[PDB]
């Protein structure tokens, strides 16, 4: 029912582990250079729809050849490839669609464009983060935002160290999945198995979990599937040390796991003056924050709210899936009074989800700064406020098991690590807003 498009090398279609599961499409667009030609692809197809080793054991697949025999392709090849899918999606429209790109090139304006245009058509795009031990945001389709970018983890859920390099990281990596010494279908023979590494393996794993999810609920959105892929991922398993101090905060400490089958929120970081951090088209912005390595506003943009931050600063958006919600942002300019700058969700049934300061149900900021409030109405939405103070570097306040963090803040940068609100400096009171069903 769930078709998983695979754009890779050729595949050993016969392979008894993925036999009749995979269909080989008449698409080939590979740059000039025999079993080794099927090698990478077959193993991934095995990882996804394998009879013995597969994640989504039953899943139907379709393969397009975009990589040659040394696994080298072209941006154009891939582009035309994705176009083939879009064209096929218009001919005999298939059910839930998952597109697997277990590849990496440099940053491509056109490919990320191709990916977004295709993703907006409600297609679940799963891609490898890259095996270069670098910020994924410099690679494509890795850098792409609507694409689920996947980093690879070893047997101890730590990041894969591939030769002198290893797994890519950064704010572009959506989550991490096992990608070291993976046993899957080997092209050596119709019944052979082999252990391969890399972010492709990681992507393919997630591509499987995604396929699994849509088998159960075909109507799921990309934004819904992402939020759930995040929610049910194993948290804080990775020793952040393996990454540069610079990239640690930005890198999600998630390790992919099967979601069994409610409010979901996610932290969205921006690139380093004005910085913008945006939510998915069906996601609501419930909070906005910012951060500097040294020392924010919620504005509207095309009928959709965005987190805007003013060396450079990161706009930190909190994107949530809040069914049937009437949200608005009310802003009160500096009062210059000793009490402070205040603003409240003056309406009834309209709860405060988050605050935003730049220079009960009420935001209190410094006298000289303008204060923004996120006021949302949703069917039965409770919103607690938890505070924590200590007499420092980082203080942390966290929502109780049943509450989703909608808004992290520092009492007069600061950000939300899963359901934990963090405040950073050199009494320090941290403020978290917790919302419910």
């Amino acid at each position, epitope marked *: 029912l769930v078709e998983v498009y695979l754009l890779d090398t050729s595949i050993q279609s016969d392979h*008894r*582990e993925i036999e009749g599961r995979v269909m080989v499409t008449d698409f080939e667009n590979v740059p000039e250079e025999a079993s080794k030609c099927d090698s990478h692809g077959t193993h991934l197809a095995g990882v996804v729809s*394998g*009879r*013995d*080793a597969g994640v989504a054991k039953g899943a139907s697949m379709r393969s397009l050849r975009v990589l040659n025999c040394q696994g080298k392709g072209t941006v154009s090849g891939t582009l035309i490839g994705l176009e083939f899918i879009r064209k096929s999606q218009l001919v005999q429209p298939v059910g839930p669609l998952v597109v697997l790109l277990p590849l990496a090139g440099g940053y491509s304006r056109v490919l990320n464009a191709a990916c977004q245009r295709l993703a907006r058509a409600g297609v679940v795009l799963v891609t490898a983060a890259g095996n270069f031990r670098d910020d994924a945001c410099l690679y494509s389709p890795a850098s792409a935002p609507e694409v689920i970018t996947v980093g690879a983890t*070893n*047997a*101890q859920d730590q990041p894969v160290t591939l030769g002198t390099l290893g797994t890519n990281f950064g704010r572009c990596v959506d989550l991490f999945a*096992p990608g*070291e*010494d*993976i*046993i899957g279908a*080997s092209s*050596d*023979c*119709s*019944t*052979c*198995f*082999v*252990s391969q590494s890399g972010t492709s393996q990681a992507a393919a*794993h997630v591509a499987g979990i995604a396929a699994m999810m849509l088998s159960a609920e075909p109507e799921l959105t990309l934004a819904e599937l992402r939020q759930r892929l995040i929610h049910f991922s194993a948290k804080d398993v990775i020793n952040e040390a393996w990454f540069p101090e610079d990239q640690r905060v930005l890198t999600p400490n998630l390790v992919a796991a099967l979601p069994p089958s409610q409010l979901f929120c996610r932290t969205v970081w921006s690139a380093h003056a004005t910085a913008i951090a945006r939510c998915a088209p069906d996601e609501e912005l419930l909070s906005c924050s910012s951060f500097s390595r040294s020392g924010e506003r919620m504005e509207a943009q095309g009928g959709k709210l965005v987190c805007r931050a003013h060396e450079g600063v990161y706009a930190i958006a909190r994107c949530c899936l809040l069914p049937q919600a009437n949200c608005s942002v009310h802003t009160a300019p500096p009062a210059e009074a000793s009490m402070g700058t205040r603003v409240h969700c003056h309406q009834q049934g309209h709860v405060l989800t988050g605050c935003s300061s730049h220079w009960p149900n009420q935001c209190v900021g410094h006298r000289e700064a303008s204060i923004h409030a996120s006021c949302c109405h949703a069917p039965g939405l409770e919103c607690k406020v938890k505070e924590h103070g200590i007499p420092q570097e980082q203080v942390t306040v966290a929502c109780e098991e049943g509450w989703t963090l909608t808004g992290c803040s520092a009492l007069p940068g600061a950000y939300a690590v899963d359901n934990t609100c963090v405040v950073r400096s050199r009494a320090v009171t941290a403020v978290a807003i917790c919302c419910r069903s």
Partner: antibody
Amino acid sequence: EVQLVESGGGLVQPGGSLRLSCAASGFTFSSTAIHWVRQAPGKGLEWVARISPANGNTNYADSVKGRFTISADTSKNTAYLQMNSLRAEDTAVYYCARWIGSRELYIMDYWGQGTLVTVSS
Amino acid sequence: IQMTQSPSSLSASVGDRVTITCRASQDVSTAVAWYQQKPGKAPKLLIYSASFLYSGVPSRFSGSGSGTDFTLTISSLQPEDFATYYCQQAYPALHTFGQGTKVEIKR
């Protein structure tokens, strides 16, 4: 210097639970697949379940489905078999064996000594 | 999943060419293996991938196999060869063993 040390086995009552251990030494643990093959006294060999330590990927025998569960501790280099809802028929010598590393997945090159599981009231 | 060994017991003397038949539950390609277990001991691998002779296993040992029908051949039988032999269906998902063949000494 490649060995699969088998421990945890013994006597347990019907309906009871039992945990077993497979201590892997002298080879890259995560890299391979580890199986459990039981054998009732007068009877032959029966594969019960497998695991691929890095992936965590498993497959079981329909005979043992839902009752037994394979886990692996990559840090401690040990494979475990959690045998809940035990029957009387489950009486067997439990072997753990490693995959040859190539070709067909069920090819067991090295086998453990075996741990005895006796289950009766 | 039924994998059948023929015979269940064969008796022969040192030097004889011993043969053991094996029928897989379906076309299993060359996804077959042969194991030798001595009473009170753990089984020992002999042949894999239907014809591949595992390291250190004496050259006496041969493996033949179409897709359904397979055959272990112990050319020039030996005293230490007198043991119980298992067939293995190392095919994806459907994994089984044969009933076992006891290589007996004729007196």
